[PDB]
Symmetry: D2
Subunit: 462 residues, 4 copies
C-alpha cells in the first residue's frame, strides 16, 4: 500500500476512473478478448514496457491488458492536454507507475517521460517501447542510446510517429525494429477517420457550445483525419470547404460533396499577404487543421479570418497553426481551460468586450483529446488490440538478444499481417452484434481465397 | 460514305448520340485533356484496338479519344443490356466498327465480339486489347492464340476481369502483359464506389419508380461497389442492412452506420432451407448483390424474400443471383424491357394479379447499366483517362515485337504509377472548380515529398 | 368494344400501362383501402367528375378508384409534358374518356380540357370537379358558367390552385364550394416535400445523366417543394445554396445546413444588370425554381449563370423562369424531348460545339413530371386518398341541389378534418410495415386526447 | 457591493460565467437586437418578473435583456439539473436575485422557487411571470392567489407548460392571461427540433463517451423533440427506430427514413410482460423518450432492454421513464454526477463488475440540460427573443389594472403574431450571414402578400 512511484493530478479520482475503466472494458471486445485469450499463456512475462500515449480511460484498458499478459510498464502521456486525470489516478491506484496530468507544462511533459525512463535515478531495465508520435523514441535515441541495446522493439501508434521512424530507418539511425501499428486497417480507418468523426464535433461543443449547423467550416487536409473531421462537421449541418495538396484526396472531397478551396489565390503560398484569399477566409467560422504538416494555418490566414472564428488543430503537433505568431502579437484571454480568446487588437492587455478575436481551442494542441476525451472506447479497441498483438510479436522476437548478423536482417519497420487485422475486425463486428457470413467452399474457390481468409490481397485499399 | 462495317439497333439515333457525346466531352476534362495533350504526338498511331466494354456515351468519348490519338478500333459491349443505342449509332456513323445494341441475346453477344476479332471473315490485324470483365481476353486466349502473338497488351477495366487475368498469370496461361486499370485510385475509389452511388438508385427508380425512403434494403457485400451501393440507398432514406464475408469490410459497414446481418443463421451457409434467416429475409423490400462472387442471393433466399421485393445485381456477372433457379421454377411476366415479375406460384403461366412475385431488374445483369445509363460522364472521366494512359504505355512498349527472353521479363499485370493517378485526379478536381494548394518548399521537406508529388507512399489506402 | 371517346398517343401502350397500374395498386394502400371500404356502398354513384390532373400511372389508380366507387369521369392532364402515355392508354382501353398525351402543344392542351367539358359537342352533365392548378376551374368559371349551376364542388390538389380559389372566394367570383386537398398533412408534407425529394434528382439524372455530387446548386424557394428539392440535391452530394423571401423559411434553410443567398446584391431586385450577384451566379451548375411565383429566375440571372448550367422549374407554372426571354434572344438546340441547349451566342442558328449554353429541362415546365415520372405511387397514395375522401364529401353534400339560403352558408374553401388526415396516415404507415402504438387510457387522459385521436390540435404544425 | 439576495453553488465562478455571457451575446443577434432597439424606450420599466427557467448561459442573456429594458427580476431554474453554475454565479454577481444550482434536491428546488416569490419573508411585488413547464405558474395559483391579482401575464416557454395553461383556461382556473411562446415558428421549429439535434448526442457523449455509430436506438415520439432527437442520433450513424401514437407523425418518420416500431406487440400496451416485444427491446442500445407523456418507457420495457443500454429522457418531466420502479427494485451505482448504472440484479447493494445494468442519464430528467448545456446560444436566440417580445406585450397591456369586465375579454392564451415571428427569423438569418431576397412589387402582387410580409397565412405549417 506504500506505492509512491507515480505523479498524477489527484489520486482521489481513482474510484471514478475505475468505474469508467469497467464501462470501457465492456466497450472493447477485441482488447478484452486478447486479455482472455492470452492471460494463461502470459506472453508478455518479462516484458518491461516504456509507454508514451495519451493517458485516457482507453489507454488504461490497454495498460491493464499488457499487465494482465505479464508485462511491467512505466507510463506517460504523449500530449500535455490529453490525459484524463481520473484514468491516470485509477492506474496509479492499481500500483502502476504513471506520470501524467491534464495541463502539463512543456517542462513537466519532458519530466514525465524522464520518470518512465529512470527508476530510482537510474535507467530502468526497459526492453520494449510503445509510443504515439515518436517523442519517447526520439529521447531514447538522442539521450539514452545505451538503453536501446536492451530493447527488442518499438510499436508506434500514429501517422506522424511512423513518418519519424521511416526517416530514421532511411538515415541508418533507427536502432531497434518497429511495428507501424497505424497502418492496420483496424487502426488507420477506425481510429484516424471514425475516431475524429465522433470526437471533433464533441470537442468543439464542449469548448464553445457553439451551434455548428448553418455555419462555414474550412478543413485543411483530407487524409484519414481530414475525412473524419469533415464528416464530423458536415453531419452537424456545417457548410464544409476542404483544402488539400494531394489531388487524389481533393478528388475524394469533391465526390464526397465538399467544395475544394485553397487559402491562397490559385493555391500559391508565396508568403505575402496578397496571396491570401481574404474573401474566402473572411467568411469562415471554423478552421480545423488535419495535416501532420507545418504552418498550414499561417499568420496571414489568421489575420484574414472572420471575426470570432474558432481555430483548432486535430493533427498530432500544434505547429500546424502559427500559434507562435499569436503569442507574440495578440492578447490571450482565457475563457476556461483549453479555451482562449485571441484578441487581434494587439498584445497590451485586452478589452473584455472587443469583438475582434478568434477562439483557439487547446492552445493549438490535439483538440479532440484537449477539449473532450478523444476517440471512444469502441473505436480505440481496434488500435489497442493491434498494439497488444504488436508488443507480443516484437517481445517474442527478442531482437536485442540476437547475434549482430540476425539483427541486420531484422532492422525494419513492419505492419501486422492481414489475417490478424481481420481477426481484430471480426471481434469489433461482433461487439456491434454484426453477423459475418461464412463463404461456402465453392464460393471461396470462385474468388480464390480460403474460407478462413485473408479475403483481400495486400494491395487492397478498402 | 458507304460504311457498312457495324451492327447497331438503329443508325438514325446517331445525331442524338452525337449531341450527348458533345455534352459528355464537357463533363470529361481528364479524358479531353489527354486528347489535347497527345493529339499532335499521335502516340497510338498504328494501334489497332479490340475493345469490349459497355457501349455507352462515356465509352464513346473513350473510343474517340483513342482514335484522336491515332488508333483504329473495332468495338463491342461487354454486357447484353448495357449499350446505349444512341451511343452505338453515333460511333458507327463516324465510320468506326461497332457491334452492339441494348437487349442482345447470348448468341448475339458472342457474335458481336467475333465481329470485332474478324474483319472480312479473317483475323483483324489487332495489336491491342481493351477489356471489361475478361470475356474478349478469354475468347482470344482460347480461340485465337495466333492473334495474341501480335498483341502488345491488355488494359482491363474491372475487378472481375483483373481476377481472371491474375488466375491466368498464376497458371502460366496469360500470353500478353496487362495493365490493371481497376486499381488506380481515380478508378476504383471513384468509379466502383461513387459511380454506384449515383447510378444504383437511378436504375431502381427508372425500372420500378418505387419510393425507396422508409423501406428495407439488404446489400450483399461491402467492397467498393457495396459501399457505393449502400450509400445510394441510404441517402434515399432506405433502412440498409449489409452482409459481408470480410470482417474488415463488415467493420467499415458498422462504423458507417449500417446493421451487419447474414442471410444465414449464424452466417452458416450449409445449403438447407433451415439455415435461412426467414424472419430477416421476410422483411426485405430490396436486395442488391455487389460481390463478384457466385450465388450470393441463392434459391432459398429468393424463396424467403418478402412478397414484391426487388432483386438486382450490380456486380459484373449475373450468377450472383440464382436466376437459373427462377427460370426453371417460376413464371416470368415482363413488365417492360429489363423489368420482370417473377411469380413464385409456379411455372405454368402466371396470374396478372398474383401478389406473390419478386421484381427482377435487368434479368440479374448489371442493374445500373441495364436499367439506367451506368456511371455519369464526370466519374467515367477518371476510369477512361486511366484506360488511355494504359493503352499508350503498353502500345509504346511493343511487347509483341520483343524477343522471347525479353517478353519473359515483361509478362506481368501492372498498375499505373501514382504520379499519373494524381495527374488524372488533378484534372478531375479542376473540373469541379476545385483549387489544390501547392506545398511550400519547407512544407514539402517537412513531410518528405516533392512539391510536384507523389504525395503518398504506394502503401497508402486513401 | 367500339369505344372511341378518348385521345391518347398510342393505345397499344395499354397493356404496359395496365401492368404498371397493378404494381401501383400494391404501392397505394390508403387509396386501395378506400376502394375496398366503399366499393359496396357506391358513395359516388351518380357523380360525373371532370378531372384535370397529370395523367400518370398514379392518377390512373385515382381514376379507377373513383369509378370503382360509382363515378363517371372525363379526364385531361393539367400539364403538357406530365402524361405518361402508357397510363393514358390503359385508362382509355378500360373505356374511360381521357384526352392526354406527353408533349401536347398549348392549343392541344386547351382542346383536351374542352373534350372533357363537352360530350358530343354539348356540355357534359358534369356535377363534380377535380383540379390541379386551377386551369379547369378557371375555364369553367369564364367560359362555361352555366355548367357550374349543376356542380356540387371542386377538389383542388395543389398550392397554386388553392391560391387561385382563395382569390376567387375573396372577390365573390367562386361559384361552388371547394376542398383544399393540398393542406392535409398527408398531402402537403408527403407530396409537396417528400415527392420532390424522390423525383427532382430523378428527373435531372434522366434528362442529363449529370453527376451531381460536388457541383453547386441554387434552389430558389424553401417552402415544402423547396425543402424537398434541396434535400434531393444535398443527398446526392451537391453543394446547395437556397434563396428565399420568407425569413422563417430562410431560417429553416440555415438550420438545415444550407447557405442562404440572394441572386441580387443585398437582396434588392431593382431590375438592373448591376443588381445581379455575378460572382455567385457564375459558380452555379444547377438552378431549380420552387416558388409558385413569377420571374424568380429572370433574364439577368440567366445571362449571368455559369456556362453549361442546368436550369429547371419544379413549381406549377413555367413562368418561374423567363423562358420567353430565352425564346426571343437565344438559339434552342433540342438534345432529346424535354432537354434543350439554349445557346447564349445569339438566335441565328447555333454552333453544335459552342461552349456557352444552358441546359433547360422540360422547357421550364414541372421538371419531375416532364423529365421523369413525378412522385412515386407510395407518396401519391396520400394525396389521392385525400382526393377521394374530398370528392365523397362534396358529392354527398349536394351543394347544387340546395336552396339559395343554404348555398350562401356553404360557399367556402375547406380542409379535410384531422381525424381523416390521421386515418390516411395510418394506412400509409402500415404500408411500410410500421406499427403505431396505442395510448393507454391513463396516457390519453394525461395528454388530453382520445385513444382514437385526433392526437394534435388543429394549430399543430408537424 | 453587499448583495446577498441569492443562492448559488459557488459565486467565484462568476467571471467564467461572464466570459461565456459575452460570447453568447455575440451568438444571439435577435435578442441583442431587441436590447439595442428597446433600451432607450425602457418598455419594461416597472416590470417585476418572476422567472423560472433553466439557469443556463442562454437564460442569463435573456435575464440581462429584460433588465436592460427596465425590468427587475427574481429567478430560479425549472429543473434540478439544468443550471450552469457559472451562469448562476454571473447573474448573482451582477446584483440579480437568483436561486439555482446544478444538483438540487426536490426540496431545494421548491425552496428556490419560493425565494423568488418571497422577498424578506413576504410576497415580492411581482407583476409578470416567465415560466418553462408551469411549475411556478402552478405554485402561484395554488399557494399565492393574492399575488396573481397584481400580475399582468405569464409567458410560457414549453409544450408541457402550455398544455397545463390550456387545462387551467378550460377549467376556469387560469387567473392571468398568457402568451404561448412555444408555438412561434422561431421557437417550436427551431428550439424544440434543431436544439435537440445539437444537444442530445452532446449530452450522451459527455455522460458516457460511447461510440454511437453502428448501434441501435429507439426514440419514443416523433413530434418536434422526437424529430430533432432522431436526427441527432441518425447523423452520428445510429440505426434509429421510432415509436409513435400519432399516425401522421409516424408517417413522417417513415418518409424520413426511419423504421417505425412499437415496444408492444401490435402496439397494444395492456400492462402484461407478454405484451412486450422482447426481441425488439433486447437489441436496443439506447432509448430516448421525447413525448411529454407519462410512462412511455415503462417497467416491463426496462426489464426487457438489452444489457448495458443507455436510458434517457429529453421531454420536460422525468415521469416519461418509470424511474420509481427502478428506485424501488434495482441498485443504483453512481458513475459520476447525472450518470448512474442501474443494476437489474436486485436492490441489496451491487456488484461493481455486474454485466446486467442500464445506464440512466440525469436520473431521467431532461438529458440535454442535465448531462450537457442544453441548446446552443444561437438557437436559444429565437426562443428568447420571443420571450422578450411576449413580456413587453403582456406588461404593456396591464391586465392586473383592468376592471373585471375588461379582464374577462382578455383572459386568454395567445401566440405572437406572424410578423414578429418573421422579424425574429430575419435577425437569426442575418446572424448566419444569410441574405433574404426582397420581393418586387409585381411578385408581391402575384402571390398576394405585402413586400414587408407576412409571407404566409396563419394556417401555414412550414
Ligand atoms: N487527434 C487524433 O485523434 C489523431 C488521430 C490519428 C492521427 N492523428 C494525426 O493527425 C495527422 C494526420 O493524420 P492522417 O492519418 O490523416 O494523415 P494522412 O497522411 O492520411 O493525411 C494528411 C493529409 O494532409 C494533407 N496535407 C499536407 N499538407 C497540406 C497542406 N499544406 N494543405 C492541405 N492539406 C495538406 C496531405 O495531402 C494528406 O492527405 C497526423 O499528425 C496524425 O498523427 C491525430
Ligand atoms: N456495375 C458497375 O458499374 C460496377 C462497377 C465496378 C465494379 N463492378 C463489379 O462489381 C463487383 C464488385 O467489385 P468491387 O470492386 O466492389 O470488388 P471488391 O473486392 O472491392 O468487393 C466485393 C466484396 O464482396 C464481398 N463478398 C464476397 N463474397 C461474399 C458473400 N458471399 N457475401 C457477402 N459479401 C461477399 C467481399 O468480401 C468483398 O468485400 C465485381 O464483379 C466488379 O467487376 C461493377
Ligand atoms: N412539381 C411538383 O410535383 C409539385 C408538387 C407540389 C407543389 N408544386 C408546386 O410548387 C410550387 C411551390 O409549392 P409549395 O407547396 O412549396 O409552396 P410554398 O408556399 O410552401 O413555398 C413557396 C416558397 O417560395 C418562396 N418564394 C416566393 N417568391 C420567392 C422569390 N422571389 N424568391 C425566393 N423564394 C420565393 C415563398 O417564400 C415560399 O416559402 C407551387 O406552384 C405548387 O403548386 C409542385
Ligand atoms: N429538452 C429540451 O430541450 C426540450 C425542448 C423542447 C420541448 N421539450 C419538452 O419535450 C416534450 C415534447 O415536446 P414537443 O414539442 O416535441 O411536443 P409534441 O407534441 O410536438 O411531440 C410529442 C410527441 O409524442 C408523441 N407521443 C405521445 N405519447 C406517446 C407514446 N406513448 N408513445 C409514443 N409517442 C407518443 C405524440 O404523438 C407527439 O407527436 C415536452 O415535454 C416539451 O416541453 C424539451
Ligand atoms: N481516447 C484515446 N485514447 C488514447 N489515444 C487516443 N487517440 C485518440 N483518441 C484516443
Ligand atoms: N406522379 C404524379 N401523379 C400525379 N400528380 C403528381 N404530382 C406530382 N407527381 C405526380
Ligand atoms: K474517450
Ligand atoms: K451515364
Ligand atoms: K411516378
Ligand atoms: K448551451
Amino acid at each position: 500500500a506504500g506505492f509512491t512511484d507515480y505523479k498524477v493530478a489527484d489520486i482521489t479520482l481513482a474510484a471514478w476512473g475505475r468505474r469508467e475503466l469497467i464501462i470501457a472494458e465492456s466497450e472493447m471486445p477485441a482488447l478484452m478478448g486478447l486479455r482472455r485469450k492470452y492471460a494463461g499463456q502470459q506472453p508478455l512475462k518479462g516484458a518491461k514496457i516504456l509507454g508514451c500515449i495519451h493517458m485516457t480511460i482507453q489507454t488504461g484498458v490497454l495498460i491493464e491488458t499488457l499487465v494482465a499478459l505479464g508485462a511491467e510498464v512505466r507510463w506517460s502521456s504523449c500530449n500535455i492536454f490529453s490525459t484524463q486525470d481520473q484514468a491516470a489516478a485509477a492506474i496509479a491506484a492499481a500500483g502502476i507507475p504513471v506520470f501524467a496530468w491534464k495541463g502539463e507544462t512543456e517542462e513537466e511533459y519532458e519530466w514525465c517521460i524522464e520518470q518512465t525512463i529512470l527508476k530510482d535515478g537510474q535507467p530502468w531495465d526497459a526492453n520494449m517501447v510503445l509510443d504515439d508520435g515518436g517523442d519517447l523514441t526520439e529521447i531514447l535515441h538522442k539521450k539514452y542510446p545505451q538503453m536501446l541495446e536492451r530493447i527488442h522493439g518499438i510499436t508506434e501508434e500514429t501517422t506522424t510517429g511512423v513518418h519519424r521512424l521511416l526517416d530514421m530507418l532511411k538515415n541508418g539511425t533507427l536502432k531497434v525494429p518497429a511495428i507501424n501499428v497505424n497502418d492496420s486497417v483496424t487502426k488507420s480507418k477506425n481510429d484516424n477517420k471514425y475516431g475524429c468523426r465522433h470526437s471533433l464535433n464533441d470537442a468543439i461543443k464542449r469548448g464553445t457550445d457553439h451551434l455548428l449547423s448553418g455555419k462555414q467550416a474550412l478543413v485543411i487536409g483530407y487524409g484519414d483525419v481530414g475525412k473524419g473531421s469533415s464528416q464530423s462537421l458536415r453531419q452537424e449541418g456545417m457548410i464544409v470547404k476542404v483544402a488539400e495538396v494531394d489531388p487524389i484526396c481533393a478528388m475524394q472531397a469533391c465526390m464526397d460533396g465538399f467544395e475544394v478551396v485553397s487559402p491562397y489565390k490559385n493555391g500559391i503560398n508565396d508568403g505575402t499577404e496578397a496571396s491570401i484569399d481574404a474573401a474566402l477566409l473572411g467568411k469562415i467560422d471554423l478552421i480545423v487543421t488535419t495535416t501532420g504538416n507545418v504552418n498550414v494555418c499561417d499568420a496571414n490566414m489568421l489575420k484574414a479570418l472572420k471575426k470570432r472564428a474558432v481555430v483548432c488543430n486535430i493533427g498530432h503537433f500544434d505547429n500546424e497553426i502559427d500559434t507562435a505568431f499569436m503569442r507574440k502579437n495578440w492578447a490571450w484571454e482565457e475563457v476556461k481551460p483549453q479555451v482562449h480568446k485571441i484578441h487581434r487588437t494587439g498584445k497590451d492587455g485586452f478589452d473584455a468586450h472587443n469583438d475582434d478575436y478568434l477562439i483557439l481551442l487547446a492552445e493549438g494542441r490535439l483538440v479532440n483529446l484537449g477539449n473532450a476525451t478523444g476517440h471512444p472506447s469502441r473505436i480505440m479497441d481496434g488500435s489497442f488490440a493491434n498494439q497488444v498483438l504488436a508488443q507480443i510479436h516484437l517481445f517474442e522476437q527478442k531482437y536485442a538478444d540476437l547475434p549482430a548478423a540476425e539483427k541486420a536482417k531484422r532492422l525494419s519497420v513492419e505492419v501486422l499481417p492481414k489475417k490478424l487485422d481481420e481477426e481484430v475486425a471480426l471481434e469489433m463486428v461482433k461487439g456491434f452484434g454484426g453477423v459475418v457470413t461464412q463463404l461456402t467452399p465453392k464460393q471461396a474457390e470462385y474468388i480464390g481465397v480460403s474460407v478462413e481468409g485473408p479475403f483481400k490481397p495486400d494491395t487492397y485499399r478498402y
